[PDB]
Every structure is written in structure tokens, then in C-alpha cells.
Design a protein around this ligand. Structure first.
Ligand SMILES: CN[C@@H](C)Cc1ccc(O)cc1
Length: 232
């Protein structure tokens, strides 16, 4: 019912202002949040901020100074403006829609890459180890996520990503599979310790898996575990 598409320049000069647009299509909505999320070289996901259905904004403290997220509802668009960019802002930028009245779904755009030529805060860090893992098909596979402080298990999510594709919501609220996910997948955990399991590894499960916490602000993502198959 909802599609998002990011657009804007692929290249920006240092100290310039990065501007991106998110064109929203599909069905009309009565609530929710439009979030900008970017993914660095190396694949770390960074939660930037959102604008709600009532125009409320939240900005990650580490950007607070430089960022604004606005809407133009008559033309169904949401905007990202980032001032004073540097090489550290080089990333793929995604917009995403979520309705907290429906925990089980999240929509992402395709993502658009951008290369570049205030206020304090705190964050839960999420560690996924190992960073890379190989397994044979048929093996039972377990990926872990360790949070530096407790998080609510209803707000611990997992994503899958394949090369040339945006993250898809894989598990929500620790143990609930999302639409599109085979039932060989499971999840479990609590407090600071969470896991994702594949009962039997299929070839199509080779992908990157990120955990994600939106129990505490700013929401954060783990560094990811890249899961590979064995046998060339
Ligand atoms: C599940 N990922 C979150 C980024 C979705 C979200 C949750 C709450 C919110 O206020 C805005 C967005």
C-alpha cells in the first residue's frame, strides 16, 4: 500500500548543503512516521530522524545542528536537508515509513547514494559478532545481537539485506516473523541479549542481517553479520 522513492544529487561538495526528496505513493494514511536512514560505506546504518503525520520531528543528536526534515503533503513529499556536509556524510540515503499502530510492517525506498567530494546525547550500542560467517546449507544457524543496555524486546527488530537492495524487515518484536519470511526463521531473547536462528540454512539466506533497537532514542542498528554459504 506504500512506496517511497528518494531522489537528489549523487555528489555534493564539502561544506555544501545536501538536499534529498522522498516521493510517497500508494494508499493514503491516517498516521505514522517518515524516517531518513542512511548506510555508510561498510554498511553501518545510521538513524537520522523522522517527521510524523502531525509534522513532529525528531533528530539524532549527532546531526541536530545540521538537519531538518520537512514535508509537502499537497505533493506527497518529505525532504531531508543537511548542512555543512563532509566525507563522513557519504552514504546511501533511505526514507522509510512506519505506523506504530502496526508493529509488523515497515516500508523502505530503494535508497539513493550521495558522495561528498551540535548537542550532546546517548545511545545504546548493538554488537553483532561475528561480522562475517560461512555455513553449509542444511546447517542450523544462529546470529546474535548484544545491546550495551537493556532494550524492550517488543522494540528489538531484525533486517535482512542483499547487495543492491534496501533492508527488509525480517523479525519484529524479538520473535515475530514479518510478511515474506519463511518459517525456518526464528528469534528469541531479552534484556541485552537477542538472537536470530535459521533452522536449516538455504542458499537464499545468504545475506546481511542487522539488529535494530527503537526502545531508546536515537534508535540504532547493529554493525551486521554477513552470512555466507559454503562450497564453490
Ligand atoms: C522500526 N524502525 C523505526 C525507525 C520506526 C519508527 C519507530 C518509531 C518512530 O517514532 C518512528 C519510526
Amino acid at each position: 500500500e506504500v512506496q517511497l522513492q528518494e531522489s537528489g544529487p549523487s555528489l555534493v561538495k564539502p561544506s555544501q548543503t545536501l538536499s534529498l526528496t522522498c516521493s510517497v505513493t500508494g494508499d493514503s494514511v491516517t498516521s505514522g512516521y517518515w524516517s531518513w536512514i542512511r548506510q555508510f560505506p561498510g554498511n553501518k546504518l545510521d538513524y537520522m530522524g523522522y517527521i510524523s503525520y502531525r509534522g513532529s520531528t525528531y533528530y539524532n543528536p549527532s546531526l541536530k545542528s545540521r538537519i531538518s526534515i520537512t514535508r509537502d503533503t499537497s505533493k506527497n513529499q518529505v525532504y531531508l536537508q543537511l548542512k555543512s556536509v563532509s566525507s563522513e556524510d557519504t552514504a546511501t540515503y533511505y526514507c522509510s515509513y512506519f505506523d506504530s499502530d502496526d508493529y509488523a510492517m515497515e516500508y523502505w525506498g530503494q535508497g539513493t547514494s550521495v558522495t561528498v567530494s551540535g548537542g550532546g546525547g546517548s545511545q545504546i550500542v548493538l554488537t553483532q559478532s561475528p561480522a562475517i560467517m560461512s555455513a553449509s546449507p542444511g546447517e542450523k544457524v544462529t546470529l546474535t545481537c548484544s545491546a550495551s543496555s537493556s532494550v524492550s524486546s517488543s522494540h528489538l527488530y531484525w533486517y535482512q539485506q542483499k547487495p543492491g537492495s534496501s533492508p527488509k524487515l525480517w523479525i519484529y518484536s524479538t520473535s515475530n516473523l514479518a510478511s515474506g519470511v519463511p518459517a525456518r526463521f526464528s528469534g528469541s531473547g531479552s534484556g541485552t541479549s537477542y538472537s536470530l536462528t535459521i533452522s536449516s540454512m538455504e542458499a537464499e539466506d545468504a545475506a546481511s542481517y542487522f539488529c535494530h533497537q527503537w526502545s531508546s532514542f536515537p534508535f540504532t542498528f547493529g554493525s551486521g553479520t554477513k552470512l555466507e554459504i559454503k562450497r564453490a
